[PDB]
């Protein structure tokens with residue numbers, strides 16, 4: 001029996017699912033599993049211990065985004081530290097890791113780079129400056145974040161904007177601050193829950209986010225597939241590191 | 243047959259000794275002992291097991307500062323974890339604990355928080371924002387750190403700056419990110435070994451650090467004594483916790 005490679009998507013929050021990264025991994029031949037960290041009934045009370053699965057059952061694991069601060073005392077005090085422990089165990093066993101937004105920030109904290117409120121948020125589609133366009137293209141990429149990470153020791157920063165570090169590699173781990181996975185329906189799920197932003201008072205508006213996303217669909221679908229393929233080609237091939 | 247209270251100063255690095263904290267505990271009537279973790283010949287190679295003393299022989303134990311990251315894998319895999327075990331044993335036994343800088347971070351890590359590299363290093367004298375001026379005064383207090391902690395679950399943050407958390411209480415333990423102990427002579431030992439920073443190229447210069455320290459000698463001497471007295475009054479009196 002031939003073993004297809006296996007990826008685990010870690011749903012840190014229930015509205016932040018794998019979307020086009022799922023398609024990308026499926027098209028690279030991966031079987032897909034998912035793990036729910038915070039169920040929908042805990043979206044306003046995320047704190048509480050959670051038992052993560054053994055990462056060595058997978059070739060790649062993917063912690064995805066979420067709305068809470070990765071440095072929240074009661075999250076670090078419960079399931080964030082358990083997730084950090086899972087990432088360390090996976091790194092050490094040579095599993096590949098692709099972290100997105102909150103998940104990239106979690107990787108930074110795991111390996112000793114702190115995360116904090118950013119001086120200037122990024123909400124919308126943005127280009128970035130990259131050192132390796134063959135791995136992290138200039139984009140544009142969709143962003144929705146108010147925290148930024150400090151690149152951890154031993155990591156190499158690959159890409160950035162003026163406002164935030166955007167991608168780093170550490171061994172077979174790649175952390176991303178942007179959402180390469182976002183398509184029209186995933187965005188709509190976020191827009192419908194953005195209570196305080198529907199009025200436009202936070203420097204953006206839903207209509208313009210929706211429209212820019214509509215325009216960039218075909219382009220963004222190609223980029224996420226190239227991103228995943230390059231991640232498999234270049235990062236999972238590195239020696240493991242921590 | 244009188245039994246004076248006993249305090250153990252844990253010298254994590256040979257240049258970070260108790261200085262004015264020793265004087266303040268002595269004036270509060272304490273007999274003083276010290277324990278060397280990393281001897282001078284290991285300053286560049288700190289990794290390696292160390293057998294720590296029994297904390298229950300003391301009324302207060304005080305882990306002091308050090309230049310290495312408390313999350314360094316080879317230190318966690320040796321004596322940093324043994325120190326964390328000593329702290330947990332102390333806390334459970336009702337021993338008081340005062341952690342300074344590296345020592346305060348070690349407490350954060352012991353009790354389930356996190357420690358990581360900060361965005362903005364804090365080097366010099368700074369005021370802090372406090373919730374209880376009778377425990378942690380605004381200061382100013384001397385800082386020299388590149389890492390910052392997340393407050394461990396169950397602990398209460400007392401003070402902070404915009405850049406980092408500065409003090410928390412957990413049971414009979416008080417963790418500090420700043421150096422209440424530093425005097426002119428202690429600082430001179432640090433400046434003499436600050437090889438990368440003498441040229442002024444790291445955002446500070448030794449001349450201004452020394453001048454500000456000299457100006458504040460008398461006020462700082464009063465503050466560290468008041469801090470120790472309040473620690474004894476309000477933290478050591480607390481119910482033990484971990």
Ligand SMILES: NC(=O)CC[C@H](N)C(=O)O
Pocket residue numbers: 016065066067068101102144145146190
């Ligand atoms: N797209 C989202 O809903 C994530 C946004 C959220 N503010 C974050 O931490 O990234």
Ligand SMILES: NC(=O)CC[C@H](N)C(=O)O
Pocket residue numbers: 258307308309343386387432433435436
């Ligand atoms: N606690 C400290 O950081 C003292 C100074 C610092 N260890 C140095 O590099 O000299």
